[PDB]
Amino acid sequence: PKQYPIINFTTAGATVQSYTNFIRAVRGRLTTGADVRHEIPVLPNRVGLPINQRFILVELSNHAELSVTLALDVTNAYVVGYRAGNSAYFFHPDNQEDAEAITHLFTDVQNRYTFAFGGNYDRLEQLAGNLRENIELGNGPLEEAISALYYYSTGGTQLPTLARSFIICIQMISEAARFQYIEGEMRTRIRYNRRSAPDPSVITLENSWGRLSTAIQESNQGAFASPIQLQRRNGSKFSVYDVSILIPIIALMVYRCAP
Ligand SMILES: CCc1cccc(C)c1-c1ccc(C(=O)O)s1
Ligand SMILES: [Cl-]
């Protein structure tokens, strides 16, 4: 059983500081920091990456002292599957190289399951019966999401509730690692001790992460060939023409080309 780095977070007594330390620790295991373009770290190139460096693990615990372990791909910071008790569940891999890679995860588990659906928001929202804009985020939702993931192992969680719990976890871990802006959005929810759905500025940043990585890494000294439309909090659109405005906003990029 290959050993991958593990980062722990608990919703029991969660604070702005403890959540910040958590996301910073996840960023630090996802990248080396040796490849930066325009002050923005780039994730490792999937091509030639050894299997022993391919994944990191996030162990989540809640007030009920239930624990689940999420596996994240270091090449895109996204969850590929999770372990709860004696079972492990994996999203349907996009290719045969990824199918072979995930056989090295959670190998001491007695029961291995692969879903027919992938981890993308499009299908998860369909299984959940709700769009991201109608699924509240925060410490309360994460606490419930951890319990739902845990009890799927013994049939006590229905699939729509599982899918919604995946959407909560991916946004509060993967997307917060990718964007300081979203990290700050979860901080506000903890500061107010309030749960709320993400507003259009968050959703469009999530939808644009791949396009933003491409536009930045292809840019002529930071200047984009074509503008990228983003959304304000009130839903209105504005255009981004170069990398500078994004430096405080995006924290990780998928590898698109050599530096
Ligand atoms: C997420 C879009 C974005 C990208 C880069 C820089 C900024 C300031 C932003 C804004 C977030 C919210 C805004 C509002 O409500 O008008 S603009
Ligand atoms: Cl292994």
Residue numbers in the entry: 3 to 261
Passage from the reporting paper:
The RTA-RU-NT-202, RTA-RU-NT-165, and RTA-RU-NT-192 structures were all determined at 1.8 Å. The RTA-RU-NT-165 and RTA-RU-NT-192 structures were determined in the monoclinic P21 space group with the RTA-RU-NT-202 complex structures solved in the orthorhombic P212121 space group. After superimposing these structures and the structure of RTA with RU-NT-206 (38), the RMSD values range from 0.23 to 0.46 Å, demonstrating no significant conformational changes in the RTA backbone upon binding of these inhibitors. Both RU-NT-165 and RU-NT-192 exhibited more comparable binding patterns, where the carboxylate group within the thiophene ring of each inhibitor formed a salt bridge with the Arg234 side chain and a hydrogen bond with the main chain amide nitrogen of Arg235. Moreover, the ethyl groups at the 2-position within the benzene rings from RU-NT-165 and RU-NT-192 formed distinct hydrophobic interactions with Leu207. The fluorine atom of the fluorobenzene ring in RU-NT-202 uniquely interacted with Val242 in RTA, while making closer contacts with Ile247 and Leu248. Additionally, in the RTA-RU-NT-165 and RTA-RU-NT-192 structures, the carboxylate group from one of the inhibitors formed a spurious salt bridge with Arg234 from the second RTA copy within the asymmetric unit. In RU-NT-165, the carboxylate being nearly coplanar with the thiophene spreads the charge across both the thiophene and the carboxylate, potentially reducing the ionic interactions with both Arg234 and Arg235 compared to RU-NT-192. In contrast, RU-NT-165 has a nearly coplanar orientation between the thiophene ring and carboxylate group, which diminishes the relative strength of its noncovalent interactions with Arg234 and Arg235 compared to RU-NT-192. RU-NT-192 demonstrated a 2-fold improvement in the Ki value compared to RU-NT-165 and a 4-fold improvement in the Ki value compared to RU-NT-202. RU-NT-165 improved the EC50 by 5-, 12.5-, and >500-fold at 125, 250, and 500 μM, respectively, relative to ricin alone with no compound. RU-NT-165 had an EC50 value of 50 pM at 250 μM.
